[PDB]
Design an enzyme around this catalytic site. Structure first.
Site, PDB file in Angstrom:
ATOM      1  CG  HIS A 348      41.010  28.795  38.418  1.00 28.65           C
ATOM      2  ND1 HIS A 348      41.027  29.893  37.585  1.00 28.65           N
ATOM      3  CD2 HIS A 348      39.944  28.051  38.038  1.00 28.65           C
ATOM      4  CE1 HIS A 348      40.014  29.818  36.740  1.00 28.65           C
ATOM      5  NE2 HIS A 348      39.341  28.709  36.994  1.00 28.65           N
ATOM      6  CE  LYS A 539      47.992  39.966  45.263  1.00 35.17           C
ATOM      7  NZ  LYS A 539      48.317  40.584  43.951  1.00 35.17           N
ATOM      8  NE  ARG A 540      39.315  37.497  50.214  1.00 38.01           N
ATOM      9  CZ  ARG A 540      38.246  36.710  50.312  1.00 38.01           C
ATOM     10  NH1 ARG A 540      37.281  36.763  49.403  1.00 38.01           N
ATOM     11  NH2 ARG A 540      38.131  35.877  51.340  1.00 38.01           N
ATOM     12  CE  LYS A 545      45.536  36.257  46.769  1.00 37.73           C
ATOM     13  NZ  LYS A 545      45.820  36.355  45.306  1.00 37.73           N
ATOM     14  CB  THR A 647      43.438  38.819  36.931  1.00 39.35           C
ATOM     15  OG1 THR A 647      42.730  38.796  38.171  1.00 39.35           O
ATOM     16  CG2 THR A 647      43.349  37.456  36.261  1.00 39.35           C
ATOM     17  CE  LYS A 651      41.393  42.870  37.627  1.00 43.52           C
ATOM     18  NZ  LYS A 651      40.782  42.691  38.928  1.00 43.52           N
TER      19      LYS A 651
END
Ligand SMILES: OC[C@H]1O[C@@H](c2cc(O)ccc2O)[C@H](O)[C@@H](O)[C@@H]1O
Ligand SMILES: OC[C@H]1O[C@@H](c2cc(O)ccc2O)[C@H](O)[C@@H](O)[C@@H]1O
Ligand SMILES: *Cc1c(COP(=O)(O)O)cnc(C)c1O
Ligand SMILES: *Cc1c(COP(=O)(O)O)cnc(C)c1O
Lengths: 807, 807
Positions: A348, A539-540, A545, A647, A651
């Site tokens: 992952h 998101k985290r 990110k 992911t 969504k």
């Protein structure tokens, strides 16, 4: 009541009501005069649960009789969220229950808000396991999710003084109506001890024993009467001065006490290793037991498939060998054949700090036998490498499962590739990167093992459940078959010019936004303009990110407004949310920066309601179900090559938001499916990132050539966003200027320009919505049903089924 | 026969045939047994011309009776091209003539190819004047085009050894059937001499006299029976040892001998100055004469509008003053008022090397009186500046019409602004640039004078005439009204999803391409693949137009193919054409580079028919009418801020080609009209160019960071494209690396990427065509009828009319 929510039959509504009252009376031991909303929630939860039992027992009895190949999904995380609505949706009881509770004078939506999230996961990886269980049940696969029943899941995030505060997620406080303890199936797990070499085999002795007690939770498929099982293990001390001995029982039970809150980060702590072996040891015994009750293990791989969700459960490989060799007495080569054919590994991430490398001295003390087996595996593996690439001594060093150096470590990823017949990435670009870099050597040795299985999300929870309004207007046009065959959304393309549909799609979004705008004021006291563009990044919190790139854009917008106050700009509500791992300092500073920016921007009279910055506190599954349906713009801006798949991006696409992002992870396939003209792509591609690294990334260059970027940095440094504490953000600026591993500045210019194109399209309601329809219509590929069907056929060797089991 | 080409009545076809035979017999003095195709062309030309005469005489008689305000368009260039077809189109005689000649056993298309282009222009500026005359006649304006009848127009370009060779354009060799000499209206023009100051006024004496003989050419409006006049002056010596004196008459007549072949470049040669005064002096006398025959000049501005096409005819300002003050004896202030209200100036460029700055010593000797008037104008002008900005001595220096320095010069642009009531740019971005930079000072003093009049092209020649097939399929859907009301093309947007139309549009393009592909083999011996994307860049060769950037892309494509031969790439036929000014060395080297690249690319077996590079020899109006209808991709890649407007870009848009270009000139308005998503925009914007200049442009930086660019430069330097002459392109590389005023390298990366997006869309025939329809449908704004209607209302103060005059 909407169509997709099922029928509200007169017989069923009457039955539900009486069972609701029966539970309120007999189960909760309360009467209508003292019952609180929580009591009502439980009465309903128990009533719905009753409808699962019959199918649950019959599904399992069915697998016993037909004896199909069983799929065992091992994961240390299952980010389930709430179970009440999801269960009603899958059993087609939502309208009936809505009606029944209505007649009892209760608001079901209110009761649903009382259920605690089963937060046994950190983010994407944990939620992926959750979507997978749903899809596996919906596809009629004899699958079992195996994990740990953590007493405390991911911590609840509180924001104090703009700083993240963590507090225990005591999710079991009021009890969990969905789980069923199975103390009768408790199994022993061994730790420490030593290895004895006798005449006929090696023996692991003088071990410390910890009991593993299973708790089963039902996983209902979508209206097919299939109900699979998620078995979670709980740690228990065996029953054998006095007071202290009893109190020390907690040392053993601490194993299942808490979920490590790290997402995409490896922390080599002994407790974590114990958790990993704990789930593996108990699970494998359960698997073998169930197999022997279907001895020759030659058929083991034909009846068992074990999927390793990342390397967390990698010890399953040497543990399976230990059992087959030491306990069943199979020869090594036979055992290895069975092991390889049984296990499959899913990677992952490619971030170095995320790869598990356990110190040999730890395995040596905790699992002495497994270390010996790992050395043997390595030895035999390297012999194959040496035979395939004679003389390539450096390859031997690079591929070893054992890493040399200051401290010897075991590379768990190398162990997984060696012991699995299949290794897959989670998005096409990610899988390619694995073969081109990180696992290049392994790919060269066994090219056949490497596959790709692009991630997906379940359209049940991520569409029908969280966005009934959208699911409804879609059903009105193409029926309800798409819910379990998402590719059918393609049929929506023939409505892109349909004025009625365009209006409905836009109406659903506006309703979602108003609904969310209201929620923010209710349980959080924050006012926002429902007419502004909802720009969200949830998101985290992690540097890769790049929430910081988003921050830079926000400040840019703010400075431009202050520069020309009376100039028109598309109003925006910038929402950013996510938790930071407790010990991840930079992530915690980023959260502070966000709230700090909000403090300035949200109280500037000149800005007005044109720009708002809100930090979404305690982002989790239940919150995602609320915010995503309300978003207009989805921020997926990780540096190219760092987000394996993502992911959350899927969504948002399925729920009517347009996407601004880099060509990273699944974003590439999403743009490919919808058409690049219907996506807001910007920034460096993977190749551009590599070129910059060859050359050497120098942030100063961007600072010197971009006046607006310079102004922002100087505002941060001078304390513009932190008056009382002028140097509060020194670490952030220092990182951005001298050691930014993720090249925030390098994508700044293109990002800001792309954001301008987004604002331009938002000014044209009709065309924005038409683009939205093109996205929703092409999001079918991202259903986890497709993902799971591929795993089933290309890895597990089993055929998915859509056949309904009897009632 | 197609509808838009008119009716082929039985009476008219019979009449045409007999008049054709009458001319062949009586006019050409030939019989069918000795007549050649040229004879047939002339018989037809004379037959068509006869149909103009009646309308021509009546139109002029009409203006005499109604006495409307007259518009005088002064230009040193009128790039007319061929007249036969255009005349037939405007008189609705095309099918009749097609039929009549068919019955006489002749192919009219063949005869049309015999007509010589009236190439009295260099490029855009000259062609703009041509489109304007057409639109003015179509809008019923009493307009007159005034210029010079050059014996030799723009030179015919021959390519020898890959080098441009120039040869005299003896376009009058076989005679011009369209013009009518008017020796009876010959006027005297004065040169040299000296100024005498008597009691009552100044006198210009002892001058050399050159006669100006006018030649009138009819300009028919589109089917409105209006026929205006284009009057071109020819130089003639007055009639007063012996042999030598007669032979020296040529010195005076050399004035109208040849068109200076410079486009966007100023060359301070005396002959050019003489040409400029020649056209101005003769024209103004003609204007005044016509006015006095309608003395008080207070009404002069109400009856006369003089439009200065660039500064070439700027001497009209001091010449009008000279006549009013010296000859009519009006006081200075009265004369100035009349002059300003009469003149309007159109600027066409901001390039410094293109601005006219005449040396004082030249004006001093050639036009002594005009120099005195110019000083007086300057004196009075600076007094106004001083009064408006007291103490700003530097502004006085910057705004002076007189430039100090090594050699005093007169800035003609400053003279034009001072003496005109209106000054306009030719595209919105260009007009803004004029107010922000070059003419900022003047804008501050008289903001009311500055306007914008975005250029346009006539849809008659640039659609109906050159692309009958497209005009037809459009007419079939929306009628024929759009031909004189191009905005109606908008109605085509409702056919963007019409499968029939989509197929027809694509069919017309394919037919045009086959037709052109054939032409290339016929009269030039070159074979090309009609299925490839036709990538064309046709326009004058100049560094700012960056044909070199196009070359770099071509070489990039070639290297990528050689790198991966068996990889699929969209086939392309890259066509580049245009003439280089004779003394513009770099432009001539660029032409050589293009043919050199062709030599390598077109004979590389590995490339095959995937890539072809052809240099379109002798690009001119007639060739443009052939290539544009056949293009798929239009290259408009000038460095942002250098192409004032561009008009070729509009021609391609109207004919079905997609556009790849920078946000420069009219490209900005084109993208704005069609929607940026339907345009291939790339590169730096004007602002980005300025930032680079502030910083300092360093080409080396791009060379060091872009491997593909480096490879290309090294190929050029090493002689890869010039074996026998390894250093043949040293000047080109040196320029690109050290003194590239146009930042070719700076737009390379984005250009190449954008070109990839073009190839991607071309692979999807249906979507490419749909985008094409969106372009054609929104090209209405670029009709010169709109441009002229704006000039009429906002500058000349006259109302355009679409009323048909009697037959
Ligand atoms: O595969 C599901 C998601 O797993 C995430 C993940 C990977 C880890 O190695 C640890 C934790 C974690 O959440 C990746 O970051 C996402 O890109 C991916 O979509
Ligand atoms: O206005 C018509 C065109 O005039 C061109 C031009 C300008 C000059 O100053 C001299 C010659 C010339 O051809 C501009 O380059 C084009 O951009 C413009 O569209
Ligand atoms: C879907 C989801 C994630 C994953 O989001 P990404 O943006 O792919 O990282 C994380 N947290 C929650 C609660 C989710 O629902
Ligand atoms: C329209 C035209 C031009 C102008 O082309 P641009 O690309 O605007 O420079 C030049 N030459 C000819 C023959 C034309 O028809």
């Amino acid at each position: 009541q909407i169509s997709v929510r099922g029928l509200a039959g007169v017989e069923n509504v009457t039955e539900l009501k009486k069972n609701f009252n029966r539970h309120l009376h007999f189960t909760l031991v309360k009467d209508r005069n003292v019952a609180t909303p929580r009591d009502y929630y439980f009465a309903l939860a128990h009533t719905v649960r009753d409808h699962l039992v019959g199918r649950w027992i019959r599904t399992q009895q069915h697998y016993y009789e037909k004896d199909p190949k069983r799929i065992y999904y091992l994961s240390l995380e299952f980010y389930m969220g709430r179970t009440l609505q999801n269960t009603m949706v899958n059993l087609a009881l939502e309208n009936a229950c809505d009606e029944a509770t209505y007649q009892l004078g209760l608001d079901m939506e209110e009761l649903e808000e009382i259920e605690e999230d089963a937060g046994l996961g950190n983010g994407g990886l944990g939620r992926l396991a959750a979507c997978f269980l749903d899809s596996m049940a919906t596809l009629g696969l004899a699958a079992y999710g195996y994990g740990i029943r953590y007493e405390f899941g991911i911590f609840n995030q509180k924001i104090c003084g703009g700083w993240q505060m963590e507090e225990a997620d005591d999710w079991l406080r009021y009890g969990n109506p969905w789980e069923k303890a199975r103390p009768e199936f408790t199994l022993p797990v061994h730790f420490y001890g030593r290895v004895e070499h006798t005449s006929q085999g090696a023996k692991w002795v003088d071990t410390q024993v910890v009991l593993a007690m299973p708790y089963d939770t039902p996983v209902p498929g979508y209206r097919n009467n299939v109900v699979n099982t998620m078995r979670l293990w709980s740690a228990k001390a065996p029953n054998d001065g006095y007071i202290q001995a009893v109190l020390d029982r907690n040392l053993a039970e601490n194993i299942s006490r808490v979920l490590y809150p790290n997402d995409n980060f490896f922390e080599g702590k002994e407790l974590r290793l114990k958790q990993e072996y704990f789930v593996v040891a108990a699970t494998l015994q359960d698997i073998i037991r169930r197999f022997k009750s279907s001895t020759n293990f030659d058929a083991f791989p034909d009846k068992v498939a074990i999927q390793l969700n990342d390397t967390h459960p990698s010890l399953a490989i040497p543990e399976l060998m230990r059992v087959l060799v030491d306990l069943e007495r199979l020869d090594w080569d036979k055992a290895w054949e069975v092991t390889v054919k049984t296990c499959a590994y899913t990677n992952h991430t490619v971030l170095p700090e995320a790869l598990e490398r356990w110190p040999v001295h730890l395995l040596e003390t905790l699992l002495p036998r497994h270390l010996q087996i790992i050395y043997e595996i390595n030895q035999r593996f390297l012999n194959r490498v040496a035979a395939a690439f004679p003389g390539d001594v450096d390859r031997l060093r690079r591929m070893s499962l054992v890493e040399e150096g200051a401290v010897k470590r075991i590379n768990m990823a190398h162990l997984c590739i060696a012991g699995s017949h299949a290794v897959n990435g989670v998005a096409r670009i990610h899988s390619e990167i694995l073969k081109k870099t990180i696992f290049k050597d392994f790919y060269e040795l066994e090219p056949h093992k490497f596959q790709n299985k692009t991630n997906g999300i379940t359209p049940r929870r991520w569409l029908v459940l969280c966005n009934p309004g959208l699911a409804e207007i879609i059903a009105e046009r193409i029926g309800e078959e798409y819910i379990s065959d998402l590719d059918q959304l393609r049929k929506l393309l023939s409505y892109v010019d349909d004025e009625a549909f365009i209006r409905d799609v836009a109406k659903v979004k506006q309703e979602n936004k108003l609904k969310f705008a209201a929620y923010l004021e209710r349980e959080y006291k924050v006012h926002i303009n429902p007419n502004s563009l909802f720009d969200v990044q949830v998101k985290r919190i992690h540097e890769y990110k790049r929430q910081l790139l988003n921050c830079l854009h926000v400040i840019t917008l703010y400075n431009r407004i202050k520069k020309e106050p009376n100039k028109f700009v598309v109003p925006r509500t910038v929402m950013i949310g996510g938790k930071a791992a407790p010990g991840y300092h930079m992530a915690k500073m980023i959260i502070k920066l966000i709230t700090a920016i909000g403090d300035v921007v949200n109280h500037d009279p000149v800005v007005g309601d044109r720009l708002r910055v809100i930090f979404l506190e305690n982002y989790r599954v239940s919150l995602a179900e609320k915010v995503i349906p309300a978003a207009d713009l989805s921020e997926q801006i990780s540096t190219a090559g760092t987000e394996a798949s993502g992911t959350g991006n899927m969504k948002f696409m399925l729920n009517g938001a347009l996407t601004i992002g880099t060509m990273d992870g699944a974003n590439v396939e999403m743009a490919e499916e919808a058409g690049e003209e219907n996506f807001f792509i910007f920034g460096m591609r993977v190749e551009d990132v590599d070129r910059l690294d060859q050359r050497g990334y120098n942030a100063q260059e961007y600072y010197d050539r971009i006046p607006e970027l310079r102004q922002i940095i100087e505002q941060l440094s001078s304390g513009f966003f932190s008056p009382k504490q002028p140097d509060l953000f020194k670490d952030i600026v220092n990182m951005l200027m001298h050691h930014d591993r993720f090249k925030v500045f390098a994508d700044y210019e293109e990002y800001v320009k792309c954001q301008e194109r987004v604002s331009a399209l938002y000014k044209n309601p009709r065309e924005w919505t038409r683009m939205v329809i093109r996205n929703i219509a092409t999001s079918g590929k991202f259903s986890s049903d497709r993902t799971i069907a591929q795993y089933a056929r290309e890895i597990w060797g089993v055929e998915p089924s859509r056949q309904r089991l009897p009632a």
